Symmetry: D2
Subunit: 458 residues, 4 copies
């Protein structure tokens, strides 16, 4: 049976899916080339990726390889009704309705994995966040021995596998694709460069040329934010803590500045550089840290400045300071005014206030529609290629003598990653040059790949 808020919405879902799947050369090429080869025949997969219409393309892809699947949603908010009814109409069971209370979802966490009222024989597992990785070890250990392997994509859940490997709890092998080149370049750096100024303009509608912005942190995401601001016409300052990253910011044309005098933070009103915070119009925070934009910074900020976060979650900006002594007023669904004059009794025509986007949380998913389709394609294409390599190995059928040595946490091989990238090149219409036999020997590389060492920094 299916649990979708409404089923009649499938008519719109298919119309939406047909155009969207036209934008994804990688999954289409995977469908085209492995026609007849059917490497997924006889494989039954259990999956938990978030139910967006994007993943419907993948779900239709790998089944076109000859695989039967069962499905659910990992997060209680990451779902779409029109796609959910679409898969329900297709035939694959779904429980991706939006309960938004987390009590109905806790009642159905095991409803998805049970066939009817008992466990059953499943072959491969594809998860998101490791929530299902906990389940088959702790709830129903019996079906563990038949699992060939696990694919998971998250860097906060891979640590769980890493520190259960040492404890000897991990029963069947796992694979990680987050640390690969294509996913790391596409998800982190690009997309943000494409969506940050979309989010700022879709919500505020202000001009950006000729103004001043401060960006804290210069990682992969910090670079994507710095590029998206300059190309619109702003002048950008970077605050960094790692000396090596700060060296790149200077050589790319930025002013490295510290909002504390001499770079020391003493937690006092006099530790701040008041000549800097009183001149800047926009602040963007790009760290996975805590309290990088503290209380003393904002009191020195110029009036009418815009605050937005793209980092981890609601810790970089002291938003808890806001609800204690400053008032909040609403403009639109996710733009607010914070009034510095007092907790209540504020006035519309006031001069000292602040502009906040997405009330602290991530904005490029809040004040816009997020990553496009050409980008969330090679991230997905690598994962389905995890299944093929992991299914052929036949972990469960191995006898106990050699079974022990293949229980490991490894990285996605580089040769596989060169095949997702080849289809994006052909998706853009590009042509890749072939190596003559005499030529490839000089590099000391196979004609088909891989071309680069394991330590190479792309």
């Amino acid at each position: 049976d299916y649990k979708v808020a409404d089923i009649t919405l499938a008519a719109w879902g298919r119309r939406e899916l047909i155009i969207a799947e036209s934008e994804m050369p990688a999954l289409m090429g995977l469908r085209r080339k492995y026609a007849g080869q059917q490497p997924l025949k006889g494989a039954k997969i259990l999956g938990c990726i978030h139910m967006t219409i994007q993943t419907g393309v993948l779900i239709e892809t790998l089944v076109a390889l000859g695989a039967e699947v069962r499905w659910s949603s990992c997060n209680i908010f990451s779902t779409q009704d029109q796609a959910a009814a679409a898969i329900a109409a297709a035939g694959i069971p779904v429980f991706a309705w939006k309960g938004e209370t987390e009590e109905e979802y806790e009642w159905c966490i095991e409803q998805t994995i049970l066939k009817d009222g008992q466990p059953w024989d499943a072959n491969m597992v594809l998860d998101d966040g490791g929530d299902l990785t906990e389940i088959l070890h702790k709830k129903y250990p019996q079906m563990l021995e038949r699992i060939h392997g696990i694919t998971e994509e998250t860097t906060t859940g891979v640590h769980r596998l890493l520190d259960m490997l040492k404890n000897g709890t991990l029963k069947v092998p796992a694979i990680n694709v987050n640390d690969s080149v294509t996913k790391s370049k596409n998800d982190n750096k690009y997309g943000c460069r494409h969506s940050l100024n979309d989010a700022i303009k879709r919500g505020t509608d202000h001009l950006l040329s000729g103004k001043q912005a401060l960006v804290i942190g210069y990682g992969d995401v910090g670079k994507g934010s710095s590029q998206s601001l300059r190309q619109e016409g702003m002048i950008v300052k970077v605050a960094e803590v790692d000396p090596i990253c700060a060296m790149q910011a200077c050589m790319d044309g930025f002013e490295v500045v510290s909002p504390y005098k001499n770079g020391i933070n003493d937690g006092t009103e006099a530790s701040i550089d008041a000549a800097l915070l009183g001149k800047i119009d926009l602040i963007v925070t790009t760290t996975g840290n805590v309290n990088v934009c503290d209380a003393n910074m904002l009191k020195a900020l110029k009036k009418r400045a815009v605050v937005c976060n793209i980092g981890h979650f609601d810790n970089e900006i002291d938003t808890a300071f806001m609800r204690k002594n400053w008032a909040w007023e609403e403009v639109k669904p996710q733009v607010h005014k914070i009034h510095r004059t007092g907790k209540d009794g504020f006035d519309a025509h006031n001069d000292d206030y602040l502009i906040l986007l997405a009330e602290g949380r991530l904005v490029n998913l809040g004040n816009a529609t997020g990553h496009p389709s050409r980008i969330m394609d090679g991230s997905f294409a690598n994962q389905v290629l995890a299944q093929i390599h992991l299914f052929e190995q036949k972990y469960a059928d191995l006898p106990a003598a050699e079974k022990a040595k293949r229980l490991s946490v490894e990285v996605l091989p580089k040769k596989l990653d060169e095949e997702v990238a080849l289809e994006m090149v052909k998706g853009f219409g590009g042509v890749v040059t072939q190596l003559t036999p005499k030529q490839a020997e000089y590099i000391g590389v196979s004609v088909e790949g891989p071309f680069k060492p394991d330590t190479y920094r792309y």
Copy 2:
């Protein structure tokens, strides 16, 4: 005492070094921080690196902290007479010479070690070409027994050590620093981005906005090459063989094409894409390979075109095809004219002629100045710090029970590289922020660093 051509030029040399010292913060900062401690007192070092004012500054800051050194040359050709005099008149022996001749290094090497016809007491080596390692191992076996360590800068020479470590021939620990972040990002990427268009606009004195350009290979050198050309105003095409690099090049705003139909390199003129080559005029070869540009692209290229090589040797462009049928003419110190008609019938008004910038060899070192001093500064401070890290161990004074555990090729630890980068960031006027304790345990990194793991790509 000395083999410099003229001792008298030392005053002019010193005049040059005095100004050159102004543009190297990293070397200067070392002297301020480590005064009074005098870490290098008692050390005796040999050197072999090529000579200039820059390495003269490096030697002066080396001897400032208390070391005694002897010095020589690594490259046969490159010579800097006035700086060599400037040091030979400082009281430090230098044995460089002019003549550009190989037969005298039989005596040039032996004069580096022989103090008075006898082996001299040594503690470190600062070899560059790896030739001192060879003489050290194969000659004077009784003397190398007290050497603490070795620092090398080149990947083509660290291989000769990494292959011999498995064989047990290596007798002293070494450090490879070419894989350090500062060394890799400064040299490969930023120097060429600074000097490519300068070399072009000196050699040709043309204009570059609104023209057709092709860049073959998309490595770090080629990643920094196209940036220098897109700023001037060129429409630039990119060719590549590694799919992931091409997938980057598409996402940087370049069109990816190949000179062969569908990419298959048959060998006959029937396979050359005649339409694409017919409107390009500037070529910059990036790859370190063989015949990446064979005869049929130069036989089919547009009528007027200039050739630029930034690779490593004389194998990227078929320059030996030139010498047998297409004649040459000199117009300026290094710019040549190549007429695609024959070796007879030279004419002065011909339209079908091509242009080489450095007769096929690398053009940056031939037609221009090379890297600026500021970039070259940070390449040397790591070699400074490596000597300290090797001197702090006292490898030769450890018991023979433990000496068997130290013959290794390790990389430079991250902390030293961060300290080198900090002295740069203070040179531009940037200020690096300091972490409070309550933010340090959040990541899992101490307040002093290093902040990134070993596997991180910057």
Copy 3:
């Protein structure tokens, strides 16, 4: 008092949009203070037809503050912002504008701007855009032009039509060409589209743009901003032009120039179109203001799934009439439609050969988005409100017949007022202007506080 807008419920939302907006326009809000006790526009009457965005609210508020009487209506089919029009109506201005209109509705709304209780009210001034409002008053209802002091024109496509009437002698009242000021030509036409074009493209269809190819028709003042908007994102752009000088400038900025027809000559057959390049183009944009710059033989040769959009002022740029008679249309969302090629009256749900069209080929950045930002629109609106005062003083209809024929022409404002606007517009960003020593002014040849460039200077 009376109004017909999409809704009144959205009155609050527009206001908060405006209070922020008022703080982004230093130059216009300056005149609201300088001429506070001095009220030059007392007893004036205006009827205007401009895009009803969030900026056009502040201009109405300004004119009301200086004592004007306003009856206003929108200018285009898809241009109004239904929260911005609600506030102006809610304040008391009779206004008639909504979204998704038709040519039947387009002409009705203007028809209420002139008529009141059926009676044509005595209008002293007109604020027109695109020449539409001019044409009715001249061809219809001649009684109005014998009591009109002046009219103000803002777009370059209506200026052409207005100088067209002078040569024929059918023009009755003088006008100020507000479009030729520097704070209008080189501030709005160039930078405005740079901020809004690639915004509007991304909100409508939402594709990644880095790494695709596009074609741009026209390298005028709008063309430059358009090309920069595309290039800064990652596109591989080409420009097509009929003017040699603008073509040379396009070559100098790092672009390549091509033409849709072989050798450049447009015979009219299918054998003149070059399908070599049209078969790899994912985007075409019209910036011409002319007719038939994208004809029927071009659309047939186009690569599948390509995108088309227009930023001129009319529908004549692309030959739409072929599409709506030969090919079937399907809607995927507002202002975006799908046209299935080779299908006269039907289409499969899995078809591969089709095209996509943004807002049916009308003004896309204003129909598929919210238009230019507030800060750029400060100079031109200041020029407009300033030009209202200059004509309102001469009292054209009160002059005698001898003095009547000496005031009939078209002109542009003097440079000093432009510089005064530019100063207050600069001061907002945080710049500091440096005054000249009494020796420096004499050396250069200008006054210390006077004009600094002659009128021939092009900037």
Copy 4:
């Protein structure tokens, strides 16, 4: 006929005159687009503009259209014999060098107008700066009744021409070329975005990525300079006296600053803002006014900063307060080192000293070759056609009534300015669209042009 020097010339530059003329699309394209018939058979012209390798091509172009102009050299520099001996070898007399009579080269002028003692018959004049134009009124007025018109190429000279028209002394109509739109944008803007940074690097070999700059003025030269510095990664600031140019600077991604507090200059040491000045690493002068470098900023400037000039007038930098009161040194044949120690007596180890790159003059002349060919080629093509247009009116051969009303000074018409833009577009390989008669009617323009009104500001 040879009068500049010895022949001295066989292959000392004549070779690269070929690449020079091939570089220039329009000046050579007209040569064959208006060949076949020769409209200029009988135009006897004289005077000078320059004498370079790029200046000898115009004379040959005129001759190919049938003219027989007589030439000589002028202006500040006349050592460029690498092309002068070629012109003399072509059969027309020319004068470049002289007996060091830079104060008075009028003796050369007497050798040009005269043929056999009797003055040479002429009907047209081609002048640079007017020192030769006055001669046909002050010294030899009897020849002028044969003149059809004159051409002038200077911004100061047109002022004197308009003054002469205000007076009555004008006796021949004259045409102006500086108003050509293809000349205004090329020589002003495009010529300094290619040459400023190249010259800076050529004379200093410095790194600019990360340093901070100040540029005074935002005219057309300023617009070129700002792009030429920004594209290299510097942080650029802008200063201006025109509010409109400042407005334009605000929206191009630059910041507006003022060397004087509140912008009010009064000569006091208390009104200047030394804090801003103590951080600027470079100042470039772009105006044409007086005292943009007062003696006070040279006192408050940061140590070891760079000062540059690209303007025309030398009172921009207070050089008189520098060549007095302070000591000077020469680093290299074009760069100088000036000490702020005091009157005299300096040790070469100090921290306060500045640097001048051409000593107050234009840096694109001394430290660089200058405007490349493809920019200043657009300038000359306005000259041959200007001769063509004035030759078909026959000003002298009109009766008295027509001659009185034809004495008028006008710019070159718009129709001729697009016939030069066509030939430069066609050079890079582009194609220009042709309009249909139905389209031509709708706009209001004939299919042959001109296409835009005269008050249009491109």
